[PDB]
Amino acid sequence: GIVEQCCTSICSLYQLENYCN
Amino acid sequence: FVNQHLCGSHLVEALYLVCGERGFFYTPKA
Ligand SMILES: [Cl-]
Ligand SMILES: [Cl-]
Ligand SMILES: [Cl-]
Ligand SMILES: [Zn+2]
Ligand SMILES: [Zn+2]
């Protein structure tokens, strides 16, 4: 999930918008 | 090991800024 995708490598703002409602 | 609890604290503050008024659901379990 988000923890797997964004704690070992950085997630940009465009990647993190994937998790918004 | 990667400390998922400390990373999660930061990821929820980043989601707060990126999602704004849309909001978000945060579920640790994968
Ligand atoms: Cl930290
Ligand atoms: Cl982040
Ligand atoms: Cl950040
Ligand atoms: Zn920290
Ligand atoms: Zn960050």
Side-chain angles (χ1 to χ4, degrees):
Chain A
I2 191 169
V3 159
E4 249 269 278
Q5 169 167 288
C6 304
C7 296
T8 69
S9 63
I10 310 164
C11 283
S12 67
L13 172 141
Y14 298 102
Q15 287 166 298
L16 285 169
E17 291 192 319
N18 292 347
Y19 295 100
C20 309
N21 278 155
Chain B
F1 66 98
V2 191
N3 183 322
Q4 293 190 359
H5 182 69
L6 292 182
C7 189
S9 175
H10 176 73
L11 286 183
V12 298
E13 291 207 354
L15 287 174
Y16 168 83
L17 292 166
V18 167
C19 305
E21 94 296 329
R22 293 165 73 182
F24 57 104
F25 293 53
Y26 181 77
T27 139
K29 157 209 166 180

